[PDB]
From a paper:
Critical for maintaining viral episomes are the homologous Epstein–Barr nuclear antigen 1 ([name]) and KSHV latency-associated nuclear antigen ([name]). [name] and [name] bind to specific genetic elements on the viral episome, where they recruit cellular replication machinery to initiate DNA replication, regulate viral gene expression, and tether viral genomes to host chromosomes during mitotic segregation. The DNA-binding domains of [name] and [name] share a similar overall backbone architecture with other viral proteins like human herpesvirus 6A (HHV-6A) immediate early protein 2 (IE2) and human papillomavirus (HPV) E2, but no other human proteins. The stable dimeric core of antiparallel β sheets is surrounded by three critical α-helices that mediate important contacts with the DNA.
We determined the high-resolution crystal structure of one fragment bound to [name]. We soaked the fragment AC37287 into preformed crystals of [name] (468–607). The crystal of AC37287 diffracted to 1.3 Ångstroms and was solved by isomorphous replacement. The aliphatic portion of AC37287 binds into a deep hydrophobic pocket made up of the hydrophobic residues I481, L520, L582, V483 and I593. The lactone is sandwiched between residues N519 and T590 within the range of a hydrogen bond of N519. This molecule binds in a region that is important for DNA binding. Superposition of the crystal structures of both [name] bound to AC37287 and to DNA shows that AC37287 binds to a region that sterically clashes with the phosphate backbone of DNA. We identified a coumarin molecule, AC37287, that binds in this pocket of [name] with the potential to inhibit DNA binding. This pocket is made up of a core of hydrophobic residues—Ile481, Leu485, Leu520 and Leu582—surrounded by the polar residues Asn519 and Thr590, which make hydrogen bonding contacts with a DNA phosphate.
Author numbering:
A (entry chain B): 474 to 607
B (entry chain A): 467 to 607
Write the structure that this text describes.
């Protein structure tokens, strides 16, 4: 009933089906993830919905906003709390090996789409002590 | 030290002062020439108000960092009910993330937050924190 989200999920599944790495552990801890940002608010939201369908084993934050980085020139730098218009979401995962596969799959999927979707960025991230999701 | 009207300061200002005191013990690099955002601390739990105060105090204490807004965590094992797929369901537990340019400073800040919140009453003392690492950095705008 949501063909847009399901079609993104299918694109992701086709890429993910080409690898067979473990997505869960007996420990069950949330120790890795992918950090997904840019594009546009709507395109990121749509990707998030498709990720949820394609990967039951993950957990997702809502969209939120990124702060600014460094400003060029002699100043002023932005305050740490200032919010940009660029959005992000986090995917929590139980294995780093699958985080790497998902990062590769997102990169491969979005590059086949027109802007702004192709401007979505992704990096693997790790959590030293895990995140105790409730 | 400075004292506001009536002999008290806001909680976020006292957090800033506490963080400044703890961080002053560690003379580690906070920035790099490359200027890339490769590390962070992920802060969660407590309550929305206690995280709000911690976030505001961290910003006041550390100009070299960048912070996300407060947001909400998904569930772990066995998510709560909802019409949407399990991975998307939101708990009532909140979080924010601090981005940093060095891994050592993320470690120092993680330890400072842990030490500071342990001195505060519940629910602030229930705040949790882990260092995180971004393999390719985050290209903040
Ligand atoms: C793979 C992907 C991700 C997000 C998207 O977001 C959109 O708005 C339209 C899409 O075709 C799309 C595709």
């Amino acid at each position: 009933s949501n063909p847009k989200f399901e079609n993104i999920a299918e694109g992701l599944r086709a890429l993910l089906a080409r690898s067979h790495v473990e997505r869960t552990t007996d420990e069950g801890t949330w120790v890795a993830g992918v950090f997904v940002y840019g594009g546009s608010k709507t395109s990121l939201y749509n990707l998030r919905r498709g990720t949820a369908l394609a990967i039951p084993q993950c957990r997702l934050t809502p969209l939120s906003r990124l702060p600014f980085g460094m400003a060029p020139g002699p100043g002023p730098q932005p305050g740490p709390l200032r919010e940009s218009i660029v959005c992000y979401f986090m995917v929590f995962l139980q294995t780093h090996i699958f985080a790497e596969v998902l990062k590769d799959a997102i990169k491969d999927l979005v590059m086949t789409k027109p802007a702004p979707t192709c401007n979505i960025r992704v990096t693997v991230c790790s959590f030293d002590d895990g995140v105790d999701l409730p």
